Design a protein around this ligand. Structure first.
Ligand code: FMN
Ligand code: FMN
Ligand code: FMN
Lengths: 173, 173, 173
C-alpha cells in the first residue's frame, strides 16, 4: 500500500483538504502536513480519523537532542509521493526560491525528485494571471513536479481529479 | 478622482509616509497599506485624518468565512495605481521573488501590470550598492514597475517628487 | 588584529559554534551573530566569555530614533571578514534571494563583496543533494563568496578547517 503525504498550504481551498484525504485513505496510507496559514481554512474534524496531521510544532516533538529523528527528513523518506493541494502562491514562490522555514517547505527542500511530487495550485484569478504564476510553475516543471491545473481561473482542481491523477500515475509505474 | 493606494515597508523613510499621503489627498482618493516593520518608523498621527490605514490584521476583519471579500483582492481592484514609498530592500526582494506573506506583498502578487505601480526605494547606501539592488530593480523594470530613484545614495526620493511623478503620468494617460 | 564576524544559522551544527568562536579568538577580535533558529541548537555558555553575541533583538537596542546607529550597518563596516558556519539551507536560499528579515541577512544584504565572506553549509544529506543546493551555491560563488565544503554529505566542515581556511586567506592578503 503506497505511502502518500498530502499537504495543505494557505489557500481558501484548504477547506476541502479533509475530503481530499478521504479520497486517498482506502487506496493508500495517508499522512497530512499543513502550514500555519492553512489552519485558517481547514477544519481538523473534516479529516479521516486514521490520518495523522503534522504541523510545524511537531518538528520539535520528534527532535529534542542530537541524534533524534528530524521529522521533515523522516516524512520525506517515508513518502512514496507528495501531493500539495492546495498549493498557495506563497508556498509556490518559496518552493521556486528553494526556501524552507516550516515543515512543508523543509520536506520539499529535502526532496529527491526521483519521487513523484504533485501540486494543485489554488489562488484567486488575479494571482493566477499575475506573471509570477507562469514563472514559478515553469521552474517547478523543470524540477519534475507534476502540475494538476486549476479550474477555469485558479480555483483548485477537484479532489477526485487530484486523486485519479495520482492513482493512475502510480499504477502505471 | 483617481484611487491611489500608498504603501510603506520597513525603511526609516517611512517616517515621511504621513506627509506623502498628505501630498496626494487633494488630488486623489487615498488608502494606505503598511507592513508590520514599517510601523517601527511610522507615526499614525502624521497621516491625513481622511486616510484609512490597512495592516495585515485587516485581512481578517474583512474575511471570516467562504464568500467574504478578501482585502488584498479588493484593494487591488479598487486601486488605479499603487505607490510603494518607502520600498525596503526586503520587500523589493520579496516582490522579485513573487512571494506574499502579508497584505502588501499579497496585493503585489495579485497585481495586473496593466495598472501602474511605482516604487521609491529607501535603504542605507551599503544595501543600495549591494549587487541585489540592481538585480531586483532590473526584474521590477521588466514587469513594468516604475522606479522613482533614491537621492544620492539610497535615501528615499522626496515626497514632492514621488507625487509629481505619479500625477504627471496619470494626466498623460 | 583582524575583525572577524562569525555567524550561525539554523543547522544542528550550530552546537559547535562556541568551539568555532574559540578557534578564532586568539588570532582575531570576534563578534558573533545568530539567527533565532540557531538558538535551538547553540548553548551560549559554550562561547568564549570575551565574545559579544548579537541577536535580532539587538537591532533595537542600538537604534531607537532617527540618527542612531543601525546595528547591521555598524557590524558590516566593523567586520574585515564574515564567516557563516553553519549556513543553513534556508539562509542559503535567502542570501541567494537577496532577502533580509533578520540581523544576519540584513548584514549580508548590505555586504560589499570587496570584503571576504566565507560560508560553511551544514544540512542533512537529502537537502544537500536537492537541486537548490548546487543552484544557490553557484549564485553565491558568482558574488565572490568562498565555500568551505561540507564533509562527505552536507555535514559542516570542521571548525579547524574553517579557521585555517580563513587564516590562510588573510595572511596571503
Ligand atoms: C482570507 C484570505 C484568503 C486567501 N486565499 C488565498 C488563496 O486562495 N490562495 C493563495 O494562494 N493565497 C491566498 N491568500 C494569501 C495567503 O494566505 C498568504 O500568501 C499566506 O502567507 C500563505 O501561507 P503559506 O503559503 O505558508 O500557507 C489568502 C489570504 C487571506 C487573508
Ligand atoms: C533601525 C533599523 C532601520 C532600518 N532601515 C532600513 C532602511 O532604511 N531600508 C531598508 O530597506 N531596510 C531597513 N532596515 C531593515 C528592514 O527593516 C528589514 O529588512 C525588514 O525585515 C523589512 O520588513 P518589510 O520589508 O516587510 O517592511 C532597518 C532595520 C532596522 C532595525
Ligand atoms: C530538529 C531540526 C534540525 C534541523 N537541522 C537542519 C540542518 O542541519 N541544516 C539546515 O539547513 N536546516 C536544518 N533544519 C531546518 C532549519 O532549522 C529551518 O530551515 C530554519 O527555518 C532555518 O532558520 P535560519 O536559516 O533563519 O536560521 C532543521 C530543523 C529542525 C526542526
Amino acid at each position: 500500500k503506497p505511502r502518500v503525504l498530502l499537504a495543505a498550504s494557505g489557500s481558501v481551498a484548504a477547506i476541502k483538504f479533509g475530503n481530499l484525504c478521504h479520497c486517498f485513505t482506502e487506496w493508500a496510507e495517508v499522512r497530512a502536513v499543513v502550514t500555519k496559514s492553512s489552519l485558517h481554512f481547514l477544519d481538523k474534524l473534516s479529516l479521516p480519523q486514521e490520518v495523522t496531521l503534522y504541523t510545524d510544532e511537531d518538528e520539535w516533538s520528534s527532535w529534542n537532542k542530537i541524534g533524534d529523528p528530524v521529522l521533515h527528513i523522516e516524512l520525506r523518506r517515508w513518502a512514496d509521493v507528495l501531493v500539495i493541494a492546495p498549493l498557495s502562491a506563497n508556498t509556490l514562490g518559496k518552493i521556486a526560491g528553494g526556501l524552507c522555514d516550516n515543515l512543508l517547505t523543509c520536506i520539499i527542500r529535502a526532496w529527491d525528485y526521483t519521487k513523484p511530487l504533485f501540486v494543485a495550485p489554488a489562488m484567486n484569478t488575479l494571482m493566477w494571471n499575475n506573471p509570477f504564476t507562469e514563472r514559478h510553475l515553469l521552474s517547478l516543471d523543470e524540477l519534475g513536479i507534476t502540475l494538476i491545473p486549476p479550474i477555469k481561473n485558479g480555483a483548485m482542481a477537484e479532489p477526485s481529479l487530484i486523486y485519479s491523477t495520482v492513482r493512475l500515475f502510480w499504477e502505471s509505474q
